[PDB]
Amino acid sequence: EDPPACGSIVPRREWRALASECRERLTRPVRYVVVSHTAGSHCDTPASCAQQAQNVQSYHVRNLGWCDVGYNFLIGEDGLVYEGRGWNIKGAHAGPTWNPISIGISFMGNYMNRVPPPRALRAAQNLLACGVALGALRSNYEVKGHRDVQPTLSPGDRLYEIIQTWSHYRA
Amino acid sequence: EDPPACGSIVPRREWRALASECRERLTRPVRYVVVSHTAGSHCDTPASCAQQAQNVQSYHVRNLGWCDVGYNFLIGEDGLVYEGRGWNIKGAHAGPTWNPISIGISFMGNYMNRVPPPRALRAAQNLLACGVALGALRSNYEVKGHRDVQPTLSPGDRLYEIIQTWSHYRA
Amino acid sequence: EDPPACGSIVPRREWRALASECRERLTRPVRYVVVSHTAGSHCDTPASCAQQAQNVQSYHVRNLGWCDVGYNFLIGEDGLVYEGRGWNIKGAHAGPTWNPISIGISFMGNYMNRVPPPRALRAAQNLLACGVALGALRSNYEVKGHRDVQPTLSPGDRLYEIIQTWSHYRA
Amino acid sequence: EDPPACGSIVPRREWRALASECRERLTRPVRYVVVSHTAGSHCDTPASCAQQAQNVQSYHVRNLGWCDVGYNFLIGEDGLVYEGRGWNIKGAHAGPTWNPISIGISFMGNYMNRVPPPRALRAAQNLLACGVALGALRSNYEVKGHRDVQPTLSPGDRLYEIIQTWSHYRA
Numbered sequence: 019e020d021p022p023a024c025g026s027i028v029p030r031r032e033w034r035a036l037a038s039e040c041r042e043r044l045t046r047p048v049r050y051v052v053v054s055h056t057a058g059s060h061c062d063t064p065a066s067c068a069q070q071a072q073n074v075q076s077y078h079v080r081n082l083g084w085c086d087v088g089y090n091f092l093i094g095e096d097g098l099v100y101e102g103r104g105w106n107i108k109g110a111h112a113g114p115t116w117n118p119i120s121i122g123i124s125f126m127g128n129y130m131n132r133v134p135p136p137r138a139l140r141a142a143q144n145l146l147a148c149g150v151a152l153g154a155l156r157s158n159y160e161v162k163g164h165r166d167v168q169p170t171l172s173p174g175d176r177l178y179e180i181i182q183t184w185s186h187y188r189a
Numbered sequence: 190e191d192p193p194a195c196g197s198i199v200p201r202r203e204w205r206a207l208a209s210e211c212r213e214r215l216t217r218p219v220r221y222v223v224v225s226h227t228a229g230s231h232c233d234t235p236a237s238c239a240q241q242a243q244n245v246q247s248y249h250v251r252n253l254g255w256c257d258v259g260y261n262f263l264i265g266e267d268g269l270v271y272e273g274r275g276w277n278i279k280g281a282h283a284g285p286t287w288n289p290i291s292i293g294i295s296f297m298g299n300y301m302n303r304v305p306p307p308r309a310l311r312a313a314q315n316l317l318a319c320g321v322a323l324g325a326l327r328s329n330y331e332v333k334g335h336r337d338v339q340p341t342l343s344p345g346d347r348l349y350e351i352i353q354t355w356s357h358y359r360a
Numbered sequence: 361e362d363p364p365a366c367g368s369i370v371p372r373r374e375w376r377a378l379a380s381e382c383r384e385r386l387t388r389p390v391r392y393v394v395v396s397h398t399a400g401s402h403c404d405t406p407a408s409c410a411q412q413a414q415n416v417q418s419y420h421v422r423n424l425g426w427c428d429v430g431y432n433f434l435i436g437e438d439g440l441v442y443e444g445r446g447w448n449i450k451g452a453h454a455g456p457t458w459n460p461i462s463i464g465i466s467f468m469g470n471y472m473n474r475v476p477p478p479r480a481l482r483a484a485q486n487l488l489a490c491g492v493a494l495g496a497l498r499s500n501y502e503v504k505g506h507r508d509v510q511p512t513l514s515p516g517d518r519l520y521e522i523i524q525t526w527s528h529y530r531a
Numbered sequence: 532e533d534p535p536a537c538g539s540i541v542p543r544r545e546w547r548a549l550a551s552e553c554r555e556r557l558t559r560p561v562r563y564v565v566v567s568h569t570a571g572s573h574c575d576t577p578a579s580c581a582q583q584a585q586n587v588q589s590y591h592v593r594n595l596g597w598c599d600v601g602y603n604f605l606i607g608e609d610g611l612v613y614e615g616r617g618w619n620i621k622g623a624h625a626g627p628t629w630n631p632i633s634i635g636i637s638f639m640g641n642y643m644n645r646v647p648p649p650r651a652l653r654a655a656q657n658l659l660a661c662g663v664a665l666g667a668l669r670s671n672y673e674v675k676g677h678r679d680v681q682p683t684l685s686p687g688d689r690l691y692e693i694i695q696t697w698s699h700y701r702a
């Protein structure tokens with residue numbers, strides 16, 4: 019109903035991110051969301067996840083020489099949403115075709131032979147509600163698996179099976 | 190103007206490929222090579238690897254709608270090399286920066302918890318030798334891992350391990 | 361199959377186009393759109409534009425002996441789409457590597473030191489958007505300028521700058 | 532600021548329109564489309580048709596003192612759609628039992644002893660189909676004539692006889 023109607027998000031400074039150097043912005047409302055999964059180690063405390071997230075960022079910044087973490091948003095299993103590039107800055111997470119037309123959310127961990135916990139899934143679906151509410155996402159936005167637009171296993175077999183159930187998934 | 194044939198490569202027709210609708214060209218000599226696994230399941234026979242390559246091309250063109258299979262070449266556990274987009278046409282295998290300036294060779298299978306059979310390395314290594322003999326690749330080309338230039342587990346742990354020991358590999 | 365009510369194209373009859381003798385089809389769906397200009401007189405009224413089109417088809421039929429107007433569509437500074445060969449038949453607009461696999465659309469003028477009006481850019485953009493919707497185009501279709509695929513100044517220098525900015529523009 | 536497409540509409544500021552001051556919104560998805568004719572002067576080029584859309588707003592804003600041009604959309608004989616109040620703002624074009632339940636499109640001119648060229652009829656048709664895509668118009672839209680609902684002669688005898696021959700027309 020009300021303007022800032024949403025989202026319990028761990029901001030950058032909180033998980034101690036490096037400064038985002040990125041500039042290329044997105045066009046709202048965004049139509050597409052791509053679900054990814056870091057495929058690496060997985061956390062479950064505000065404390066271990068805030069670490070997790072920061073590793074990840076570091077990797078994409080230092081090793082691959084990028085301007086900030088690939089994703090716009092990372093879901094922890096602590097149940098929290100770790101802020102990535104956010105709703106307005108174009109991601110680097112799913113090919114040159116989808117990055118300027120999608121929001122990229124990554125479950126932190128590896129879900130080929132596991133599921134993220136109930137609450138991880140809530141954080142994210144809620145985050146998407148939040149995104150629509152703020153006009154970042156088109157009301158009828160579609161959700162694609164990462165393997166749906168990239169050669170990849172991401173977002174893992176189990177998690178994929180789950181997002182394929184969602185109201186907004188459009189194969 | 191020496192003719193050093195070194196193409197023990199299974200041609201597209203032999204592994205029975207759909208047609209590349211890909212048209213954009215890499216300028217030769219190409220300076221970098223990026224090694225990726227498919228992270229699919231392995232094939233150990235020309236007859237299965239024929240099918241395997243059929244499918245990898247299929248996942249790229251059908252589900253992803255790509256001009257044609259992402260890689261310039263595919264290595265098999267059958268010890269044979271498969272014609273991807275070959276030496277001249279730009280791949281789609283490492284994203285907008287490396288794509289135009291690298292050959293993306295890809296091992297067919299998943300190497301978090303395997304190593305590719307010695308014959309698969311031999312095929313791979315020699316392929317490059319071949320690549321240099323023609324002028325496709327620079328005498329002094331540098332080899333990256335897939336994870337080195339894009340967030341992914343590709344080319345797999347045990348294989349990543351191995352290609353780091355390789356001569357032409359670069360930090 | 362699913363048919364919308366897409367576009368506002370001026371059918372051949374209306375701009376008084378001759379009968380086409382053209383008979384060769386393209387494969388659905390076309391991956392490429394190639395943007396050009398006519399480098400001739402610029403029309404800006406629906407009337408003078410209808411002429412311009414007819415003028416162009418003419419020079420293509422009675423002078424180059426082609427089966428039709430060269431372009432699949434034409435585009436008025438009047439802000440209207442002119443039906444040429446259409447979505448299904450082959451254009452004669454960009455060399456024989458490119459004609460069999462593309463859609464040529466051609467702005468009606470000389471855009472070396474001029475911009476097309478905003479209304480013409482919308483026509484084009486919207487006309488494309490349609491193709492996709494009709495399934496005449498791939499959704500991930502790729503736009504190139506004439507000069508990308510032939511040695512020319514088409515689609516004019518100023519229009520060329522403009523098209524580079526486009527979502528689906530691949531260099 | 533957008534991939535600029537749907538029904539190739541001329542935007543407000545493009546015809547030099549004084550900013551709306553209107554606030555009442557429509558309840559999407561809207562049921563009715565009331566086709567009127569301005570009853571004023573007819574134009575037939577984009578230049579003359581901007582000057583005409585502008586002239587109507589003037590009479591609505593300066594003289595009658597409405598927050599904006601009455602109709603949601605105007606259709607030029609230049610065969611281009613002029614956006615007045617658009618898809619969301621309630622129109623002032625079909626009275627107070629109809630204004631909150633319909634999109635008011637109007638044809639610039641007097642269609643008693645003439646009809647609008649197909650080029651506008653097409654633009655109009657497309658506008659509605661573009662409406663549905665947006666979800667601003669409900670796919671089973673029903674199209675009434677200005678006289679069907681308000682004692683008046685709009686949209687002219689000759690135009691009115693055409694309207695009834697439309698598919699989604701209900702009498």
Ligand SMILES: C=C(O[C@@H]1C=C(C(=O)O)C=C[C@H]1O)C(=O)O
Pocket residue numbers: 366486489490493533534536537538661664665
């Ligand atoms: C594809 C078109 O453009 C439209 C523009 C849209 C937008 O801007 O969000 C949404 C849907 C499309 O229907 C078209 O009408 O041809």
